[PDB]
Amino acid sequence: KFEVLLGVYTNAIQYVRFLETALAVSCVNTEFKDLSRMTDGKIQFRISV
């Protein structure tokens, strides 16, 4: 006769997300669809004195 056994499982996860943290006020978050393709990027400030 074949014996079938049951052994219980538990998970210790906790729900955590980035926006619900307060640090997300430090940055500004945009989702870029295809980021691996972008080779390089730059920002060009022009300041008059």
């Binding site: 997300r17 980035f18 926006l19 619900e20 978050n29 989702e31």
Partner: protein, 315 residues
Amino acid sequence: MKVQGSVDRRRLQRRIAGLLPPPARRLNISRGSEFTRDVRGLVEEHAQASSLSAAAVWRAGLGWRPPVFGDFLIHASSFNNAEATGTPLFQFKQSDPFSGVDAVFTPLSLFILMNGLTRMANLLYDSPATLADLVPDFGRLVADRRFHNFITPVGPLVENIKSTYLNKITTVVHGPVVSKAIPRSTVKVTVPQEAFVDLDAWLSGLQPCPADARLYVALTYEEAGPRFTFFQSSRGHCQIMNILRIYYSPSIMHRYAVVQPLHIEELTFGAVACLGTFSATDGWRRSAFNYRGSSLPVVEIDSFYSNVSDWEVIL
């Protein structure tokens, strides 16, 4: 108003579902209708795999690495039933009768034949005169220095079906070491910790680290008999020999008396072979044997790809 998060699970599920290979085709011979249906599926698959006409018939988009098993039969005296699985073994050649026994050899058996580890080897083998009967010209082949040509490496054993006199043995020859009984459970390879010299630390900008580190095997005729040594190195086949000769020089200095000026057949100090390749940047693991008189510490190394080499002269 949940955030929805930063990454999406639909993408992961889809791409992994794409990554799974199609299932193997079971064929059901006991029942007629299932047999017929699997045969229909087989003819459709051959039509789907060999016709250059269509494009969905092109399936090659996106390795076979078991070992090559070789089976040897040996006497139940020339092998302990308890000796651990995966220890590298070395083989000997009989002259006329080969079917009777193969006489495959273990490193402790070599340490016994060659005359702590001694006591362990005696607690495995109290009366090893069969060991002397396996090689009749041991006393002859130490001097003829032809001892290494006949000792051919076989490498780690997987399984040994146990019988009264004979033993059935399965040996990994080429490829990674793996088992058979199950979905190919892996094994590891063990060598005693003493009588093993780490030649990457014996001399110890920054030296570069290769991917793969190799294990060599060498056989030396000293005035205190012959002896065997395995070396965990990584540099190169052209440098391991030089470093080894530099290592043995203090033992080589002693051979001025034994060498014969007239007969040049005894001069060779030893030979080096390459057994296999394992992962560097890891090291190895320490364990003791669990036998009745077990006191020897042993190194054991994972990820062994068995690629045996021949004996090369060094002096």
